[PDB]
Amino acid sequence: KGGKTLVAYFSATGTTARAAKLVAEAVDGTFYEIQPAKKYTAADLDWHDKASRSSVEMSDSKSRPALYSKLGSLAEYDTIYIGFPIWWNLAPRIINTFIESGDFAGKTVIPFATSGSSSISNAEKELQTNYPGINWGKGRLLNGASRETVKQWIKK
Numbered sequence: 429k430g431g432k433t434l435v436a437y438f439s440a441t442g443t444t445a446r447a448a449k450l451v452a453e454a455v456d457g458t459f460y461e462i463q464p465a466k467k468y469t470a471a472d473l474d475w476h477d478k479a480s481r482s483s484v485e486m487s488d489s490k491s492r493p494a495l496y497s498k499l500g501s502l503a504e505y506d507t508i509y510i511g512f513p514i515w516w517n518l519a520p521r522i523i524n525t526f527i528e529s530g531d532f533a534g535k536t537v538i539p540f541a542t543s544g545s546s547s548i549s550n551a552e553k554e555l556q557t558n559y560p561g562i563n564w565g566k567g568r569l570l571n572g573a574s575r576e577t578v579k580q581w582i583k584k
């Protein structure tokens with residue numbers, strides 16, 4: 429009952445959630461939301477305020493926002509897509525909490541993201557460098573995500 433695909437994603441304002449729905453449909457994967465214990469408020473997401481929760485977390489590479497629930501088994505999956513918004517050219521720190529809360533061995537892991545304009549390159553490189561034991565697959569920025577842009581990425 430293995431060899432399945434998981435599409436895991438974090439989304440604060442729904443943009444990455446909609447791109448992840450399109451990815452899950454395109455790969456016939458299980459749609460899974462990475463849930464913070466404390467949801468990000470408008471004040472938390474204030475990029476201009478150096479004291480906002482997101483500003484503090486993104487200034488600290490060791491920050492690990494807690495998850496809402498413990499992670500279930502990932503044994504049934506051989507492929508895991510991980511989606512997120514780009515925050516300050518990086519994956520939000522909850523993505524580090526997620527990766528550090530399960531066993532990703534023997535799995536292909538593919539990052540995808542949405543952004544205001546930044547590329548996924550730095551965010552992806554930092555994930556590869558911090559988790560060199562994972563079989564990273566080439567990631568993709570999915571801005572203005574549609575059934576057609578996602579179909580093209582998956583069909584190659």
Ligand SMILES: Cc1cc2nc3c(=O)[nH]c(=O)nc-3n(C[C@H](O)[C@H](O)[C@H](O)COP(=O)(O)O)c2cc1C
Pocket residue numbers: 438439440441442443444445473474475482483512513514515516517518542543544545546547
């Ligand atoms: C704290 C914070 C930092 C951000 N930093 C970046 C950035 O470095 N580059 C970028 O192009 N967009 C940046 N954005 C914009 C988001 O990546 C973009 O709006 C994303 O699509 C939001 O996705 P979501 O609705 O799934 O949460 C930032 C947004 C927030 C809240």
Ligand SMILES: [Cl-]
Pocket residue numbers: 468469470471
């Ligand atoms: Cl709010």
Ligand SMILES: [Cl-]
Pocket residue numbers: 558559560561562
């Ligand atoms: Cl690793």
